[PDB]
């Protein structure tokens, strides 16, 4: 039995003690503390060695990524890549702290575009008419100029030319994950999430990669240079194989939609994730998968019955940097 | 202005008058009334006489308003499946967009039913009894066994047709085929293929159909689903429309993909959203329609509406006051 | 076991069948159907006769209201009285369909003001600066002119003069419920909820009655005519007594805050309500009473363990007229 | 302007820098940064030297900014009780507004603790074991038995003082007395009465304290709690302030009552809201600060901020970056 007690600022501003006191504060502060515990459990498992038997089984994929004792799936929605959480995610990928990424089309393209031009702070209440007249697009309380996509087009079209040529003359069979790896290699910029992902052999899955500006540009490109194919079936085999041959898995899911469902569905193939943390603001009452509690996924076998999953009901822009500070960042030396 | 006033039950109960009174009741009741007006504007425009197939690569004839209907998977698990099936059966909408679950659960419902449960049922006990929870709904594991048995011979034919008849499969082409195969008038996708209403679902692998494709590929390798051609197909539906309307139930890719197609024509002329998402986390799912105006996904002169509500409650009422009143004009 | 099935519009627009089909539609449509059942259970109980023994016990209050077999508490927030749901509530009170009202200060004063001047439709996005400059106040997507409160002041001050005189010369001991009854008698208008409540001996509780325009006016009035006292302790005895000596109770609670907690707390005094329907958009995750599920109240004894309470997660402006259409309005003849 | 950029953990972990980076991270992180700026503006104004007691009927000296702090009952059940107690202990705010639960649970915590539980615990089992649920917190029935035993002799004295010493009780006067009686430095209300910080709670009867007053009145009749004099007291705090700031955690009466007092001076100069309510149902709880601007509850030249978040997460971080940095100036 654990008593409720908040941090006592008469002790001064001891930030580490303040964060640890969330666990006994109640409501979503307590869920934050539980999330720290769950993520630290994933990390402690990941750093355990593989036994001979575990190594044999985990080695049964054609993946270049070194084996570890816990394969961590990180999912996030496009808005988080527009936000400063892009830097948080890039750090984790840079230092091989996660093993598989899942995101939406916007979550791919906006990382690359940020290497060409920035996103700016705005306000939620800015009116669309006046923004449109000024060539400014709104993302929550963030703003991106139209010219950002012009720059993206100039950068991307010559790459699409090469990809079509490689498909038609060198037998390349493109999928979303293969395309994302190539784009990360091309951007060649250490501020990019996808640069680090391809450098570190972290695959990125995005089965609806066409739903955004990258798709727009493939669309226009296809009328002058037709025939590019992105197969989603091979990518399904690839993500599912990462779950099936994992020793243990953890899911860290920021937001809802496909990123949440696709990571969870991959883990159904192994009979469930061993660890899981959700951070989102969706609610269960409309029946949506996005708003379902982790315990819904337990009924399906997407999360193991003996797991202790956690959902933090909060905007991940507030919580995720704090979570990383208390978990992965404390074990940085082990990942270097 | 317009004064607030609710329905007066001293009149007795006339349901049409009760629904009409929502417009002057305030808060989301007023937004419901606004949504009725917008959908009726879409319908009236669609019924205006017109004075294409090679640029769209579609056999569907153009009308004066191309209506895109998008909905999330949970709504197909719900009774709203019947509402959507009605609209598609009578050719009242032109393009469907849904998630993988929104395809497969319509087909599975032709094989076995979904049941009522409760949100609070615990996962451990359900899993031990072979029952999967979908909100306050329940589906037995056996539903997916029946789906597997039904689907595997169709996948065999699809691979054979790809490799020897030159078929280039995409999600929309697969969904048309599955609707033809299920051959059941309770099915949304049966009616969609019969009426040449395309269905787009770029992440069609993210669900049980994906599971089945995956398992099948180790018995019969080689199936390819291309998403690029499907982007061309949906985008050209918007580009060559005379007018467009968007009716979007929920968030995620169904919302973004319909709106992105309409960005290609510099915006939809009419738009109604029904969902429970909120803007404050910056998500596209939760964004107000006026965010889409800044992008050009909705025209500046449009009068879009969002109803903040569970569509299981609101969408049947909306259909009752719009499409179902115009049933004669659609025959 | 009940199968999911929605209304089939191939049958035509049969509105009663459409509403009944909510029960098998799922998510909050199913909760709506469950709410119809719960409210119809309250009504069927209310119309049962009292046995000799039940009558003896129910008669143990000094209340003028006739005894029934189910005392129904109706709570609602101020915004709903600004909305058209004011008419829904007035109808129930007019026809003696509920027994006790609980609301906030705004929920009292805005009913009275609507008898003097209307509320208008606006938009949520209208900016406060320009509204303030034009003397217009915003309530969600509704609008009220400043002059509404000027009219209220002119109407109310002479009544406050009389109330102070009656306190000081006739020994009247005012409470919120006694004041609300007097204001309803004074407004003398069949469009008013509180007119009908006092005519029908339905008490209205509002322990924070001072938190609004009526309080503002009492405040100003007290400097020229000091000494008005509103005692909340006597009103606590009065509401609690209505629960303690009820044969059965039902709670219909629209929204959160004090109206929700005060009705539930009264029912703790009898060891719990027999029937309960909540309609609100609040969520549980921040720990608030407003967003708590009915099953939280079961732990306290505010709702009986054998009850089948229901929450509908929706804006009551959409749901409550539909609920009334399917329940109370179907038994109108019995209440006349 | 300002570019978006998050904290770079390649720097290591400096928590001050991490919190500062929220301002440029976007969405509610940006609103948190804005809230820090607004609260620091309140504090800096409060610390400006000044160049009252009869018109306010208060002994509390005026400062250059009168800060109203409002919070709901659940936050006193939570660990935020310690956060609030710290601010009141050091005289950092001037007026408190809370619900009945927000008074009684502070006092009860001096007699017995609240425990961690889970939101999903079922009411039947908890009730059978004499445990009451508050979100994911738990309190045994015995806590209220201890409260009763502690409170009944105090109520006896209060009635005696009303009837023979002319005391005219109101909620704020009762809350001051209960804080003096609990005589425990862990208590918010102990520190509030010691520092002459009034506490307003117009529906003080809506809770366990009400229960106890009710039961007590059948053993010792006659206690009166007047809410009208307390309206005069809170309103005059706003009317005669030099500047005001509002820090409001949650909704309901605590939010509306603080804002109504500030309407009396044609608006607060600074305002920060932290709550999870949404606007779409028209509720005051969910209204954006800009609704209060239309009424005159917030000045038009103010720069109010709402953080859409559970205050159990955000309020300790906010205090860490504002009041707790200025601790030396408050001594």
PDB file of C-alpha atoms in Angstrom, chain A residues 86-252:
ATOM      1  CA  UNK A  86      11.362  15.481 -33.497  1.00  0.00           C
ATOM      2  CA  UNK A  87      14.576  16.113 -31.583  1.00  0.00           C
ATOM      3  CA  UNK A  88      13.644  13.638 -28.838  1.00  0.00           C
ATOM      4  CA  UNK A  89      12.911  10.929 -31.390  1.00  0.00           C
ATOM      5  CA  UNK A  90      16.072  11.696 -33.368  1.00  0.00           C
ATOM      6  CA  UNK A  91      18.165  11.287 -30.216  1.00  0.00           C
ATOM      7  CA  UNK A  92      16.732   7.833 -29.482  1.00  0.00           C
ATOM      8  CA  UNK A  93      17.324   6.675 -33.062  1.00  0.00           C
ATOM      9  CA  UNK A  94      20.813   8.217 -33.231  1.00  0.00           C
ATOM     10  CA  UNK A  95      21.920   6.155 -30.216  1.00  0.00           C
ATOM     11  CA  UNK A  96      20.255   2.871 -31.190  1.00  0.00           C
ATOM     12  CA  UNK A  97      17.874   3.041 -28.233  1.00  0.00           C
ATOM     13  CA  UNK A  98      14.881   1.757 -30.240  1.00  0.00           C
ATOM     14  CA  UNK A  99      14.735  -0.889 -32.971  1.00  0.00           C
ATOM     15  CA  UNK A 100      11.708  -0.255 -35.217  1.00  0.00           C
ATOM     16  CA  UNK A 101       9.919   2.985 -36.115  1.00  0.00           C
ATOM     17  CA  UNK A 102       6.330   3.337 -37.315  1.00  0.00           C
ATOM     18  CA  UNK A 103       4.939   6.664 -38.467  1.00  0.00           C
ATOM     19  CA  UNK A 104       2.608   8.338 -40.936  1.00  0.00           C
ATOM     20  CA  UNK A 105       3.510   9.991 -44.233  1.00  0.00           C
ATOM     21  CA  UNK A 106       3.669  13.396 -42.576  1.00  0.00           C
ATOM     22  CA  UNK A 107       5.966  11.936 -39.931  1.00  0.00           C
ATOM     23  CA  UNK A 108       8.441  11.028 -42.675  1.00  0.00           C
ATOM     24  CA  UNK A 109       8.305  14.065 -44.927  1.00  0.00           C
ATOM     25  CA  UNK A 110       8.261  16.740 -42.207  1.00  0.00           C
ATOM     26  CA  UNK A 111      11.545  15.420 -40.753  1.00  0.00           C
ATOM     27  CA  UNK A 112      13.213  15.757 -44.145  1.00  0.00           C
ATOM     28  CA  UNK A 113      11.695  19.173 -44.818  1.00  0.00           C
ATOM     29  CA  UNK A 114      12.991  20.454 -41.460  1.00  0.00           C
ATOM     30  CA  UNK A 115      16.480  19.872 -42.836  1.00  0.00           C
ATOM     31  CA  UNK A 116      15.608  22.330 -45.636  1.00  0.00           C
ATOM     32  CA  UNK A 117      13.506  24.949 -43.791  1.00  0.00           C
ATOM     33  CA  UNK A 118      12.081  25.373 -40.286  1.00  0.00           C
ATOM     34  CA  UNK A 119       8.634  25.156 -38.699  1.00  0.00           C
ATOM     35  CA  UNK A 120       7.475  28.159 -36.701  1.00  0.00           C
ATOM     36  CA  UNK A 121       5.394  28.866 -33.617  1.00  0.00           C
ATOM     37  CA  UNK A 122       1.903  30.234 -34.149  1.00  0.00           C
ATOM     38  CA  UNK A 123      -1.491  29.964 -32.393  1.00  0.00           C
ATOM     39  CA  UNK A 124      -4.383  27.506 -32.676  1.00  0.00           C
ATOM     40  CA  UNK A 125      -6.865  30.345 -33.271  1.00  0.00           C
ATOM     41  CA  UNK A 126      -5.292  31.819 -36.435  1.00  0.00           C
ATOM     42  CA  UNK A 127      -7.901  31.910 -39.185  1.00  0.00           C
ATOM     43  CA  UNK A 128      -7.453  29.752 -42.258  1.00  0.00           C
ATOM     44  CA  UNK A 129      -8.549  32.363 -44.782  1.00  0.00           C
ATOM     45  CA  UNK A 130      -5.856  34.882 -43.847  1.00  0.00           C
ATOM     46  CA  UNK A 131      -3.213  32.171 -43.500  1.00  0.00           C
ATOM     47  CA  UNK A 132      -4.071  30.756 -46.933  1.00  0.00           C
ATOM     48  CA  UNK A 133      -3.931  34.231 -48.475  1.00  0.00           C
ATOM     49  CA  UNK A 134      -0.391  34.595 -47.089  1.00  0.00           C
ATOM     50  CA  UNK A 135       0.716  31.120 -48.176  1.00  0.00           C
ATOM     51  CA  UNK A 136       1.006  29.791 -44.613  1.00  0.00           C
ATOM     52  CA  UNK A 137      -0.235  26.388 -43.469  1.00  0.00           C
ATOM     53  CA  UNK A 138      -1.319  25.659 -39.918  1.00  0.00           C
ATOM     54  CA  UNK A 139      -0.422  22.571 -37.863  1.00  0.00           C
ATOM     55  CA  UNK A 140      -2.056  23.084 -34.466  1.00  0.00           C
ATOM     56  CA  UNK A 141      -0.241  26.100 -33.030  1.00  0.00           C
ATOM     57  CA  UNK A 142       2.629  25.647 -35.497  1.00  0.00           C
ATOM     58  CA  UNK A 143       3.060  27.207 -38.935  1.00  0.00           C
ATOM     59  CA  UNK A 144       4.819  26.159 -42.137  1.00  0.00           C
ATOM     60  CA  UNK A 145       5.217  28.309 -45.266  1.00  0.00           C
ATOM     61  CA  UNK A 146       4.169  26.991 -48.663  1.00  0.00           C
ATOM     62  CA  UNK A 147       7.750  27.476 -49.812  1.00  0.00           C
ATOM     63  CA  UNK A 148       8.793  24.614 -47.505  1.00  0.00           C
ATOM     64  CA  UNK A 149       7.135  22.240 -49.988  1.00  0.00           C
ATOM     65  CA  UNK A 150       8.641  23.944 -52.983  1.00  0.00           C
ATOM     66  CA  UNK A 151      12.045  23.287 -51.462  1.00  0.00           C
ATOM     67  CA  UNK A 152      10.998  19.697 -50.802  1.00  0.00           C
ATOM     68  CA  UNK A 153       9.922  19.272 -54.418  1.00  0.00           C
ATOM     69  CA  UNK A 154      13.258  20.578 -55.722  1.00  0.00           C
ATOM     70  CA  UNK A 155      15.124  18.173 -53.438  1.00  0.00           C
ATOM     71  CA  UNK A 156      12.929  15.146 -54.034  1.00  0.00           C
ATOM     72  CA  UNK A 157      12.291  15.018 -57.791  1.00  0.00           C
ATOM     73  CA  UNK A 158      15.872  14.059 -58.810  1.00  0.00           C
ATOM     74  CA  UNK A 159      15.780  11.260 -56.232  1.00  0.00           C
ATOM     75  CA  UNK A 160      12.491   9.964 -57.646  1.00  0.00           C
ATOM     76  CA  UNK A 161      14.154   9.962 -61.094  1.00  0.00           C
ATOM     77  CA  UNK A 162      16.880   7.691 -59.740  1.00  0.00           C
ATOM     78  CA  UNK A 163      14.433   5.433 -57.897  1.00  0.00           C
ATOM     79  CA  UNK A 164      12.383   4.850 -61.045  1.00  0.00           C
ATOM     80  CA  UNK A 165      15.576   4.178 -63.007  1.00  0.00           C
ATOM     81  CA  UNK A 166      16.757   1.675 -60.388  1.00  0.00           C
ATOM     82  CA  UNK A 167      13.364  -0.028 -60.420  1.00  0.00           C
ATOM     83  CA  UNK A 168      13.306  -0.343 -64.195  1.00  0.00           C
ATOM     84  CA  UNK A 169      16.982  -1.122 -64.903  1.00  0.00           C
ATOM     85  CA  UNK A 170      18.274  -2.752 -61.695  1.00  0.00           C
ATOM     86  CA  UNK A 171      15.257  -4.758 -60.504  1.00  0.00           C
ATOM     87  CA  UNK A 172      14.660  -2.798 -57.312  1.00  0.00           C
ATOM     88  CA  UNK A 173      11.317  -3.674 -55.676  1.00  0.00           C
ATOM     89  CA  UNK A 174      10.421  -0.563 -53.653  1.00  0.00           C
ATOM     90  CA  UNK A 175       8.412  -0.576 -50.429  1.00  0.00           C
ATOM     91  CA  UNK A 176       7.715   2.290 -48.003  1.00  0.00           C
ATOM     92  CA  UNK A 177      10.497   1.189 -45.634  1.00  0.00           C
ATOM     93  CA  UNK A 178      13.046   0.920 -48.460  1.00  0.00           C
ATOM     94  CA  UNK A 179      12.065   4.364 -49.725  1.00  0.00           C
ATOM     95  CA  UNK A 180      12.344   5.928 -46.252  1.00  0.00           C
ATOM     96  CA  UNK A 181      15.811   4.450 -45.819  1.00  0.00           C
ATOM     97  CA  UNK A 182      16.870   5.942 -49.164  1.00  0.00           C
ATOM     98  CA  UNK A 183      15.441   9.357 -48.310  1.00  0.00           C
ATOM     99  CA  UNK A 184      17.297   9.310 -44.992  1.00  0.00           C
ATOM    100  CA  UNK A 185      20.525   8.440 -46.789  1.00  0.00           C
ATOM    101  CA  UNK A 186      19.951  11.241 -49.304  1.00  0.00           C
ATOM    102  CA  UNK A 187      19.160  13.933 -46.724  1.00  0.00           C
ATOM    103  CA  UNK A 188      22.585  13.184 -45.231  1.00  0.00           C
ATOM    104  CA  UNK A 189      21.995  15.441 -42.223  1.00  0.00           C
ATOM    105  CA  UNK A 190      22.503  14.501 -38.541  1.00  0.00           C
ATOM    106  CA  UNK A 191      19.435  16.492 -37.505  1.00  0.00           C
ATOM    107  CA  UNK A 192      17.217  14.015 -39.386  1.00  0.00           C
ATOM    108  CA  UNK A 193      15.505  11.072 -37.719  1.00  0.00           C
ATOM    109  CA  UNK A 194      15.577   9.079 -40.967  1.00  0.00           C
ATOM    110  CA  UNK A 195      19.227   9.811 -41.626  1.00  0.00           C
ATOM    111  CA  UNK A 196      20.043   8.124 -38.316  1.00  0.00           C
ATOM    112  CA  UNK A 197      17.537   5.323 -38.803  1.00  0.00           C
ATOM    113  CA  UNK A 198      19.116   4.132 -42.045  1.00  0.00           C
ATOM    114  CA  UNK A 199      22.641   4.611 -40.671  1.00  0.00           C
ATOM    115  CA  UNK A 200      21.731   2.428 -37.664  1.00  0.00           C
ATOM    116  CA  UNK A 201      19.700  -0.178 -39.615  1.00  0.00           C
ATOM    117  CA  UNK A 202      16.469   0.789 -37.863  1.00  0.00           C
ATOM    118  CA  UNK A 203      13.606   0.077 -40.304  1.00  0.00           C
ATOM    119  CA  UNK A 204      10.769   2.569 -40.670  1.00  0.00           C
ATOM    120  CA  UNK A 205       7.289   1.341 -41.570  1.00  0.00           C
ATOM    121  CA  UNK A 206       4.584   3.577 -42.981  1.00  0.00           C
ATOM    122  CA  UNK A 207       2.025   1.584 -44.969  1.00  0.00           C
ATOM    123  CA  UNK A 208       0.128   4.752 -45.994  1.00  0.00           C
ATOM    124  CA  UNK A 209       3.260   6.614 -47.068  1.00  0.00           C
ATOM    125  CA  UNK A 210       1.400   8.089 -50.055  1.00  0.00           C
ATOM    126  CA  UNK A 211      -0.947  10.113 -47.819  1.00  0.00           C
ATOM    127  CA  UNK A 212       0.841  13.453 -47.808  1.00  0.00           C
ATOM    128  CA  UNK A 213       3.266  15.719 -49.616  1.00  0.00           C
ATOM    129  CA  UNK A 214       5.685  12.922 -50.515  1.00  0.00           C
ATOM    130  CA  UNK A 215       2.757  11.163 -52.172  1.00  0.00           C
ATOM    131  CA  UNK A 216       1.736  14.384 -53.907  1.00  0.00           C
ATOM    132  CA  UNK A 217       5.159  14.594 -55.405  1.00  0.00           C
ATOM    133  CA  UNK A 218       5.264  10.928 -56.452  1.00  0.00           C
ATOM    134  CA  UNK A 219       1.880  11.599 -58.070  1.00  0.00           C
ATOM    135  CA  UNK A 220       3.100  14.575 -60.102  1.00  0.00           C
ATOM    136  CA  UNK A 221       6.373  12.814 -60.883  1.00  0.00           C
ATOM    137  CA  UNK A 222       4.531   9.787 -62.265  1.00  0.00           C
ATOM    138  CA  UNK A 223       3.075  11.696 -65.192  1.00  0.00           C
ATOM    139  CA  UNK A 224       6.512  12.593 -66.578  1.00  0.00           C
ATOM    140  CA  UNK A 225       8.250   9.400 -65.361  1.00  0.00           C
ATOM    141  CA  UNK A 226       5.622   6.701 -64.853  1.00  0.00           C
ATOM    142  CA  UNK A 227       5.680   3.355 -63.124  1.00  0.00           C
ATOM    143  CA  UNK A 228       6.984   3.737 -59.567  1.00  0.00           C
ATOM    144  CA  UNK A 229       5.497   0.968 -57.380  1.00  0.00           C
ATOM    145  CA  UNK A 230       5.454   0.921 -53.577  1.00  0.00           C
ATOM    146  CA  UNK A 231       4.508  -2.551 -52.336  1.00  0.00           C
ATOM    147  CA  UNK A 232       3.019  -2.733 -48.849  1.00  0.00           C
ATOM    148  CA  UNK A 233       2.902  -6.540 -48.659  1.00  0.00           C
ATOM    149  CA  UNK A 234       6.663  -7.061 -48.393  1.00  0.00           C
ATOM    150  CA  UNK A 235       6.780  -4.410 -45.644  1.00  0.00           C
ATOM    151  CA  UNK A 236       4.131  -6.345 -43.707  1.00  0.00           C
ATOM    152  CA  UNK A 237       6.344  -9.424 -43.793  1.00  0.00           C
ATOM    153  CA  UNK A 238       9.304  -7.329 -42.642  1.00  0.00           C
ATOM    154  CA  UNK A 239       7.635  -5.695 -39.616  1.00  0.00           C
ATOM    155  CA  UNK A 240       5.949  -8.936 -38.566  1.00  0.00           C
ATOM    156  CA  UNK A 241       9.267 -10.820 -38.735  1.00  0.00           C
ATOM    157  CA  UNK A 242      10.854  -8.307 -36.345  1.00  0.00           C
ATOM    158  CA  UNK A 243       8.181  -9.134 -33.758  1.00  0.00           C
ATOM    159  CA  UNK A 244       8.091 -12.906 -34.338  1.00  0.00           C
ATOM    160  CA  UNK A 245      11.806 -13.450 -33.706  1.00  0.00           C
ATOM    161  CA  UNK A 246      12.245 -10.952 -30.875  1.00  0.00           C
ATOM    162  CA  UNK A 247      13.316 -12.320 -27.497  1.00  0.00           C
ATOM    163  CA  UNK A 248      11.113  -9.681 -25.811  1.00  0.00           C
ATOM    164  CA  UNK A 249       9.299  -6.677 -27.228  1.00  0.00           C
ATOM    165  CA  UNK A 250       8.341  -3.252 -25.954  1.00  0.00           C
ATOM    166  CA  UNK A 251       5.938  -0.780 -27.519  1.00  0.00           C
ATOM    167  CA  UNK A 252       6.233   2.998 -26.962  1.00  0.00           C
TER     168      UNK A 252
END
